[PDB]
């Protein structure tokens, strides 16, 4: 099911999340232990549907991480399945 | 109506929010310009119903700010009316 998660960057600007583009989607490839990403329950294999309001269908892995990096207000919003 | 807001501390650990205890409730007394608080649309007079899962009914102004300070994971959750 659809779910929104809100991640706050840690004190070094990081969230602890690696993403993979595949099958026209964006998926969670690696979640760092004890991180903003693990705090909201992200897991290997989760699909990311939106990042900061934008549909990620057809984004590259590097685009998805760029948009993560460009987060506004120390805050990353994502829609997940 | 009920609403949840999620605030991410800025890079100096701050959120830009002053709260007042009155009439058995917690209300927004001051919102700093260009802050985590203004980013989520908080306004003078808003009522804070919950902070980080806890009902704030009957909290002191100093308790409410303490709980703000004790935020977990660089993240403040609030329920607002
Ligand atoms: C607890 C360790 C945190 C490192 C983690 C992170 O915060 N970013 C990360 C860094 C800046 C913005 C968004 C995420 N990336 C990352 C992974 C792959 C490619 C690029 C960045 C990471 O692996
Ligand atoms: C853009 C300026 C930010 C200052 C603002 C803030 O982040 N906290 C604040 C500081 C630490 C934790 C939570 C909030 N308080 C504050 C107000 C009244 C009493 C105590 C703290 C503030 O006024």
Residue numbers in the entry:
A (entry chain A), B (entry chain A): -1 to 79
Give the published text.
Melanoma differentiation-associated gene 9 (MDA-9) is a small adaptor protein with tandem PDZ domains that promotes tumor progression and metastasis in various human cancers. MDA-9 contains four domains, the N-terminal (1–109aa), PDZ1 (110–193aa), PDZ2 (194–274aa), and the C-terminal (275–298aa). PDZ domains are small, globular PPI domains containing approximately 90 amino acids that form a classical two α-helices (α1, α2) and six β-strands (β1–β6) structure.
Herein, we identified four hits—PI1A, PI1B, PI2A, and PI2B—targeting the PDZ1 and PDZ2 domains of MDA-9, using NMR chemical shift perturbation (CSP). The similar CSP patterns indicated that PI1A and PI1B bound to the same pocket of the MDA-9 PDZ1 domain. The complex structure indicated that PI1B was bound in a typical substrate recognition groove between the α2 helix and β2 strand of the MDA-9 PDZ1 domain. This groove was mainly composed of the residues K124, I125, G126, L127, R128, Q142, H175, and L178. PI1B formed two hydrogen bonds with the backbone of Ile125 and Gly126, and residue G126 was also a conserved residue for binding to the substrate peptide. Notably, the side chains of residues Q142, R128, and K124 were rearranged upon ligand binding, relative to the free form. The cell counting kit-8 (CCK8) assay suggested that PI1A, PI1B, and PI2A were not toxic, while the wound-healing assays demonstrated that PI1A or PI2A alone suppressed the migration of MDA-MB-231 cells.
